[PDB]
Amino acid sequence: NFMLTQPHSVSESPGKTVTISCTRSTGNIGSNYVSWYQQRPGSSPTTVIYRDDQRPSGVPDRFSGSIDRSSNSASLTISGLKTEDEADYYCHSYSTGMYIFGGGTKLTVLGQPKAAPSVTLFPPSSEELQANKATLVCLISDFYPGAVTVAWKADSSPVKAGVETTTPSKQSNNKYAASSYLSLTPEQWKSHRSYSCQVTHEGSTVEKTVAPTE
Amino acid sequence: EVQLVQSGGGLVQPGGSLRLSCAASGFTFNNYWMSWVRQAPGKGLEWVSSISNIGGTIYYPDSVKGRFTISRDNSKNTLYLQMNSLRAEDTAVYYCTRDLRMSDYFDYWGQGTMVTVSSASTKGPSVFPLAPSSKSTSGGTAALGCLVKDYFPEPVTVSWNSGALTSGVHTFPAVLQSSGLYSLSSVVTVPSSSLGTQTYICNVNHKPSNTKVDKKVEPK
């Protein structure tokens, strides 16, 4: 009952080469065949690699698969990147009546300059607190590539409940936006010194904090 | 060419039941294992069930064991998924797949069938101001907005000052919360020097509940 772990996202320019890794937590990656699936936005998946390194008919040799046992990983490599390659990619392995998927990697084929997210964090309104509710609002805009992860902290402790986060969506200027919400009671809000919304984009973070004492 | 033509699905309440169908052409059914794989909105692929050529062997993950039943009719080249005791977490696009069992992969995928499990019903939003303050201002520009909380179904529209304020307005796509209700926010950036001279009102329209809210957003 293993896991397959992939990077959240990768990106490269047209014509370049990119690699997506798939690391197996327990057991040997070479013990079971690895396959790879391409899923374009709003589309059903299709197979791009099977039996570790075999291509289906109609998949060009720009796509290749490999196995690195020393790192217990499988890798999908795409050369000569084209716009049509922009998609989420999933690795897969089977063992003992269980079918395991990696978490997916978003591949962006860069079509504009990269941009770090702008983050604005609002505290609960007085009106909401007086209605016995409290929502923190983390607005994330103007980032490219369109892949982020969002984490919240209460004082210094990671928050594991009450978080709702959107998928990134393309803005009219072709960069991306997302939002995240933290639900609290008014007593929770008042009893902590600060809350933080932490946005990770391309392995670097932007974190905003708000405090009930303003 | 291989075809996997899906039907069924739709909307049910928690505890309800649905049957998915996948009709196949371009290969002989009894020569292949078949599977179901699902994908919740914005999330990854999750295998649901597999059945051998003959039905002699069936596998489920723990997430659906005792609730979902895979079956096949080889004389009709059709695969089924009977979904009982449904819950909100089962909301997903469900894909039929043809498997190559000896190579451990899914070589063809259907176009998918959406299944939605929800007890949510029509509900107008609770609208709250997101007030500008020193803490929402950056180098002379203030952000203000309004929070449109806990409505169903989509959509909501937001304007500012009855459409007179458009520059700097950003209305974010809604989040579907684990409560089954939606929330969204709209923010506008304005000069901080305008906070004492201009009135800012967000105009929220939720036609499904026949509700409109005009919320004044005052500086702190």
Author numbering:
A (entry chain L): 1 to 9, 11 to 27, 27A, 27B, 28 to 66, 66A, 66B, 67 to 106, ...
B (entry chain H): 1 to 52, 52A, 53 to 82, 82A, 82B, 82C, 83 to 100, 100A, ...
What does the paper say about this structure?
Pfs48/45 is a cysteine-rich surface protein that plays a critical role in male gamete fertility. We also provide molecular details for the development of mAb TB31F, a humanized version of rat mAb 85RF45.1 with improved biophysical properties, now undergoing preclinical development.
These structures also revealed how the variable region is optimally configured for binding Pfs48/45 even when unliganded (all-atom rmsd 85RF45.1bound/unbound: 1.52 Å; TB31Fbound/unbound: 1.25 Å). In addition, humanized TB31F Fab shows improved thermostability characteristics with ~10 °C higher Tm and Tagg compared to its rat-derived counterpart.
